[PDB]
Design a protein around this nucleic acid. Structure first.
Length: 181
DNA sequence: AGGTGTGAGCCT
DNA sequence: AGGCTCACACCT
């Protein structure tokens, strides 16, 4: 049937172990790693749209204390619900199935910025969630799919240097800093 | 054009 | 210190 698997899920888990962190900024920040998924079991000729949002992973604020993540408290008023529609939407199942669906251009921010942006609240842990929707009649239908490997804490600066190291290692745009010699 | 971390600078 | 921001020199 409909199956949706995470591409490069293992890079996500490598980050998860160390407690993953995603920078947000005022102008909005791209994710690394990028969320990419494989889809199967769609109707090749049906029309679907893909949506992405972020759900709170627990109720505590967090803080980094001497090389370790520890909870804080007082979860600031939950962030406004935002969503990002994949720019290829709407499109045929064939298109969504022919190659991994990658959310490379979504931008995460800490301000009520608009235009394909998701506002997160800093020092909170969030989980990406992907949705598939089909408008029709009997085939009317929305799925949601979570990937615990991709949980992360929003931050305005990296805190675990080991995370920064992995970011620099794999994100091509930080390749200039990977001059590790 | 457009994304990346690093320092530096800022307020509390 | 502790969190947020902005120029910048790199990269794509």
């Amino acid at each position: 049937e409909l199956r949706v698997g995470l591409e490069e899920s293992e890079l996500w888990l490598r980050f998860k172990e160390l407690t993953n962190e995603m920078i947000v900024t005022k102008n909005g920040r791209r994710m690394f790693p990028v969320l990419k998924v494989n889809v199967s079991g769609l109707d090749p000729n049906a029309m679907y749209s893909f949506l992405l949002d972020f759900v709170a992973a627990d109720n505590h604020r967090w803080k980094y204390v001497n090389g370790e993540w520890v909870p804080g408290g007082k979860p600031e008023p939950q962030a406004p619900s935002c969503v990002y529609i994949h720019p290829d939407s709407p499109n045929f199942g064939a298109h969504w199935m022919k190659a991994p669906v990658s959310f490379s251009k979504v931008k995460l921010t800490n301000k009520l910025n608009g235009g394909g942006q998701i506002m997160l609240n800093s020092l909170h842990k969030y989980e990406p969630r992907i949705h598939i929707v089909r408008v029709g009649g009997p085939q009317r239908m929305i799925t949601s799919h979570c990937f615990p490997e991709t949980q992360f804490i929003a931050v305005t600066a990296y805190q675990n240097e080991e995370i920064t190291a992995l970011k620099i290692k794999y994100n091509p745009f930080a390749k200039a800093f990977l001059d590790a010699k």
